[PDB]
Every structure is written in C-alpha cells, then in structure tokens.
Design a protein around this ligand. Structure first.
Ligand SMILES: Nc1ncnc2c1ncn2[C@@H]1O[C@H](COP(=O)(O)O)[C@@H](O)[C@H]1O
Ligand SMILES: Nc1ncnc2c1ncn2[C@@H]1O[C@H](COP(=O)(O)O)[C@@H](O)[C@H]1O
Ligand SMILES: [Cl-]
Ligand SMILES: [Cl-]
Ligand SMILES: [Mg+2]
Ligand SMILES: [Mg+2]
Ligand SMILES: [Mg+2]
Lengths: 359, 359
C-alpha cells in the first residue's frame, strides 16, 4: 500500500458520458505542493452520473460499481461533476448529491470530503493544470505558451495563458500561483458544444453521415465533411459566437503548442484514422473523415469495421472538431494539435490534486 | 369492464421526458374504422425510457411501474417510442427493445403486439389525427385547413394539409385515407428542437433567465425575452433552416386554425401565464414571459411561486416558442394558437388507434 508512505487522495471525474475514479499517491515539496503524482488505481464506468434516475436504488448500484473493488481504502474522496450535471437545475442536482452523501455516510471504506458540481471555468483550470503537470511545465517559467482543449461530451473547454485584463469577465480569468510562479490564464467552457449535446442538432443531416446511413427521419446519409463542418460552424458561430469570443484573444495571446484531451484522442487513435506521434492537424483530420467515412458506403464500411461503436459518428465528429478548432477558435488548419494517448487515462483530475480551490 | 363489450387496445407514448400508458375503448363503423374512442385508463411515469440504463433491473422496474397496476391486462399493447429513442443509434435502441420484449414474455396477459421507434414523420401524422379526431373534423370534408404542432421534449412536429408536391421528399408527405375521405398532409419533425434538447444550447445565456438566476457558468441571468428569442431563432434558422423549409409551404397552403399539444399547454395553463379560452397569441406569450419572468429578480419570483419546477425556464421557453412559431414557421404573432388543456391527456396515441400503419 503506497498510501502508508505517501499522501493519497481519490478524485472522481463525474463526466457526462461516464465516471472515472482515480487514486493518486504523491509527495509534497517544501511548500506542501504535490510532486511525484502517480495514479495507483483507475476505474471507469458508464453512463454519466447525471443521466441515471436519481433514486437510492439506482445511485447505490452506480456508486457501488464505481468504488467497490479498489485495492486501497481509508482515503479521502473528492467527487466532482462536470457538464452533464450542469445541464440540470440546482434542485435536481440536489437529489443526486443528497443520495450520494447518504451512501457515503452508510459505509466505512471511503472518506467523502467534497461532492459537488464544478463550473466549466474550474474544469478548464484543472484541464490546463493536468496537461501541464504531465508536460512538466509547471515548476519553471516557460518561454512558450501552451494551450489546452478538453473535448468533452457535454461541454468543451479552452484555456491558454493571458495577462490579467480589466475588460474580460473575472469568471474567464484565473490567476494561478503554483511552485512559486504566477500564471495568468484565460478559461472558457462552452456548454452544449460537447460531442453528445452537439450531435443532437445534426442527426438528420445527410452531409454528416456515410452514404446510405439510415438517418432517424428515414432519409439516407450522403456524407461530405466540408458540408457537415459548415453546418456545425453555424452552431459554433451563429448560435454560440465562439469565433467572436475566442479569436480576438488568441490573436493577442498566441499559443505555441496546443494539447487536446477528451474524445478526440479516442477518435484519432481508432482503427479508422491514421496519425503519427500522437498528433494531428485539422486539415488532415477533415480529409481523413471525408474520404475514410463520409464518402464511403455505410453498410460496406460498417461490415469492414464491426468493432467500433463510434464508427457511425466519425464523419460528423471529424467535421465537428474542425468546425470547433478552425472556424470557432481560429486555429490554422495546418497547425499541429497534440493529443494525449487514451491509454494514459489523463483527465482534469490531476488538477484537483495540485489545486484544491474552486471559483 | 368496457373491454368485454368494446374493442380495447393499450398504446404507450414513450416520449423523451416520460411514458404515458393509455387504454382506449372504442367501437367501429361499417368499414371497421374506430369511433367513440374513450380513454378508460391512463398512467404516466418519468423519466423517458430512452434516458434510463438499458439493463434488466432498471427496465423491469420501469415497465412494472408503468403497467403493473393497470386494471385490464389481457389486451393488445403497442409501445411506440419517439424522439428520445431516435437520439440513439439502432444498436443501443436494440438493447432496450430486447429487454422490453423479454419482460413482456415473462408475463401471460398483455399481448405485446409491437414495440418500436416510430419516425418523426409517423409521429407528426399521429399528432394530426389525434387532434382532428377530438375536433371531429375527420368524418367529413372540411372547408378549412387545420394545422397541428406538437411541442415535445426532443423533437417538435408540424403537420398541415398540402396537396401532393413532387418536388418535396416523399417522407414529408402522407396521403391519408380516413372515414372514406382522402387527405394529403405535409409532415415534418425537427430533431433536437424539442424543449429539453434546445435548452442545452442556451443555459449560459443571461438573456434567457430571470435577473440574478445562477447560470451554471457562474454568471447571472439578465433576462430580455426579445434578445433570448433572437438567440433561439439562430438555432431555428441559421442551423436547422426551419424558415426556409416551412414558410414557403405555409405561404401557398395557409392554415386557418392552429392547434398545439405538448409542453406549451402546460406553460400556458401554469400559474404564471394568463390565457383565456385555451388559446394564446405568440405576441402575448412573449410579452408575458418578458414581464412576468425575464425582468423579475429570480429569488423574489422563486419565492412567490414555489411550486412550479418549470418556473426557472419560463423566460427561455416563452422566447423559444415565439422563435419557433413566428421566426421559424412564419406564423403571425397575433394569430390565435389553440392549445389542448393538459387535463385531457391528449397525445398522438389516438392516431395509432385510428391508423395502425407506419412508414
Ligand atoms: N472512438 C471515439 N471517438 C470519439 N469519441 C470517443 C471515442 N471513444 C470515446 N469517446 C468519447 O471520449 C470521452 C472519454 O471516453 P472514456 O475514456 O471511454 O470515458 C467520452 O466523451 C466518449 O464519448
Ligand atoms: N409547466 C410547464 N412548462 C413547460 N413545459 C412543461 C411544463 N410541464 C410539463 N412540460 C413538458 O410538457 C411535456 C408533457 O408533460 P407530461 O404531460 O407531464 O409528460 C414534457 O415535454 C414536459 O417536460
Ligand atoms: Cl426523426
Ligand atoms: Cl459552465
Ligand atoms: Mg470530461
Ligand atoms: Mg408478434
Ligand atoms: Mg411527445
């Protein structure tokens, strides 16, 4: 048990599509800031906590499945829900947390410390800390700007360095003090623009599915990624005004290295897409979705790749990633976007280890 | 027991927010077409079937709750799911129907006849049959045009008389033969434009919530219904092209009387809204939303009207209904919109009683 020799906490990412339990061990430096953070246990379950019926039977079963086979107990737990919970009013969220609090009070293996919904701005701060902790860019002053994107199921986050600015909402700026260095970040989360929520606006768009895919309305797919991308861009920009919010800020505060986490790592690592060095460009992502999925015959393609439950969505998702990054954020189609390998189980929860405060 | 002397079937509306069981008795005319349709049992449950975990324990608890206390069971059952289920790919929908079929086979009473997902176009035909059945406009040729809107949680339907147009998809037209008359209808369903799915694009729009309502992002509501409406219109028209699809048809095929079912009946019948004769105008809907919700201080208003779970959403919903009907469908803001009183339990299921065929 590493936790007899190191500090350990458990942090649960209660995401829109599923929850991920992590147990982390760590030591601390002379200011009591964590270092040597190691994941010693992981467990993921589906579906999203905020999608299940909020009654005792259902919540008991879900929590029991998530937690019950961990090799290490008697450790503090931080349960933090994200955009799936944010879709619900406080009073519905309350049903979940009252039931959760009760389940923890009824047992003795886990010590619940916090269980609450964090804002997309909190989540975006944690997204940047987690990635930059793994890149070891936190201990010393960097001479390059690292931006992070988290491609979630219900919201997407963007976060990048930006000097403190009297003209931008205080909620979209964070002054972070860590390892003796002062870091100022712009943060934004776009609720409804995560892959599940976005997709619900395009399921009858023939351009967004392979040829002959059966759309729910009875029409047929007729895929064309640039056309699908244009439809998604309408939601990005005509509805959410992503471009007007984010592009002027990126123009003034350029990002040298972009890192992405969330669903895009899984798409880019699938059998259908081909990228080297765990990185992509939006130009290649759109090309590959267009020709590998959109313009293919659905039943033939589905028969060739039977084991991928996301296959039917790849025309829409490649198009959507491009719409978000290129037409929303203004990122050049030729710019490299690194993505963290899925095997790494990297989500924003490392950020909670390093930084316990919330908005 | 009515069912000893009259034909009875059970029809379940498995909607996105809940399921409604109806047992209908009826007689038939000389062509075996139902007449004297009466609801003899109703039970409603939440949440929507396509929201719950598709496992044996969860599905059996949900079906038991919906069906077990029905006071007549040896009758044919039709279980028809709508837009909630259409958000999921066929492979996920199959997990639900496989479990549901198994549950029916573990009892000997209900004769399950069909359990399947119907298209939005089927649903729109049944919406028009159900309302016109109640208005007694089916047995004779009408000299006026009756249009129906169903304001659902995941999709909205619109349906109205229109002669065959060879330039419009076959999927959006139905040639209906009922009571010896031939009726040609235009049908359309807009997936993702139902109240629940729409709302997930505007939860951090301050214009769509009462003053100081706590938005999930940490910002404050600052309601203004015209402004909220314009945001929703961008989703109606810039994204879904509702205007371009519907207005040219209604221009050439005007509707004389509009009837609505779905959530708008509940909103219009609430304590916050004031309408006479079970009818509204969009101009009065928007003005009442603006003044009675959008421009009120949230804590004050919430304290005044504690018993209404939808109150927080009424600035958004009033603006949304106006965006859909006026800016999307092109209906004049002073045109009367009849809504069916909620206590009538009217949904599209009476259409299934009348017309068993699907597309
Ligand atoms: N092959 C894939 N393509 C796109 N998105 C994916 C894929 N696999 C998983 N996701 C999404 O990736 C996120 C993280 O998934 P997981 O680590 O499996 O919970 C969720 O939003 C999933 O819906
Ligand atoms: N007061 C209300 N305002 C707006 N929508 C409502 C209200 N009450 C119920 N609904 C919606 O009306 C539809 C039918 O509700 P029910 O008859 O309660 O299943 C669902 O989409 C509900 O979410
Ligand atoms: Cl549909
Ligand atoms: Cl948020
Ligand atoms: Mg996430
Ligand atoms: Mg059979
Ligand atoms: Mg419905």
């Amino acid at each position: 048990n590493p936790c007899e020799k190191h500090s350990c906490i458990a942090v649960i990412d209660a995401g829109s599509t599923g929850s991920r339990l992590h147990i982390y061990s760590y030591d601390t430096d002379d200011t009591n800031t964590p270092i040597h953070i190691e994941e010693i246990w992981n467990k993921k379950i589906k579906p999203g906590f905020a999608s299940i019926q909020p009654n005792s039977v259902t919540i008991d079963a879900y929590l029991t499945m998530l937690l019950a086979d961990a090799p290490i107990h008697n450790i503090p737990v931080y349960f933090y829900a994200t955009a799936g919970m944010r879709l619900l009013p406080q009073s519905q969220q309350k049903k979940y947390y009252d039931e959760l609090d009760y389940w923890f009070r009824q047992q003795s293996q886990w010590q619940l410390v916090e269980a609450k919904t964090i804002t997309g701005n909190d989540e975006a701060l944690f997204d940047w800390l987690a990635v930059n902790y793994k890149l070891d860019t936190l201990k010393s002053v960097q001479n390059k700007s690292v931006g992070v994107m988290d491609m979630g199921g219900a919201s997407v986050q963007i976060v990048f360095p930006m000097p403190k600015n009297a003209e931008i909402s205080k909620h979209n700026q964070v002054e972070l003090n860590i390892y003796g260095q002062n870091i100022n970040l712009y943060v934004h989360s776009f609720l409804g623009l995560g892959q599940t929520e976005m997709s619900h606006q395009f399921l009858n768009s023939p351009s967004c599915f392979a040829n002959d895919y059966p759309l729910p309305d009875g029409e047929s797919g007729q895929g064309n990624a640039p056309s699908c991308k244009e439809e998604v861009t309408s939601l990005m920009n005509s509805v959410h005004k992503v471009n007007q919010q984010i592009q002027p800020l990126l123009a003034l505060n350029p990002v040298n290295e972009w890192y992405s986490i969330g669903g895009i790592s899984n798409l880019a690592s699938s059998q259908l897409f081909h990228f080297e060095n765990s990185e992509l460009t939006n130009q290649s992502l759109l090309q590959q979705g267009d020709n590998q999925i959109c313009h293919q015959q659905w039943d033939i393609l589905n028969g060739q790749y039977p084991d991928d439950e996301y296959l039917y969505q790849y025309c829409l998702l490649s198009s959507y990633y491009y719409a978000l990054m290129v037409d929303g954020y203004g990122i050049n189609p030729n710019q490299t976007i690194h993505y963290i390998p899925p095997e790494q189980n990297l989500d924003w929860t490392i950020g909670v280890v390093l930084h316990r405060a919330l908005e």
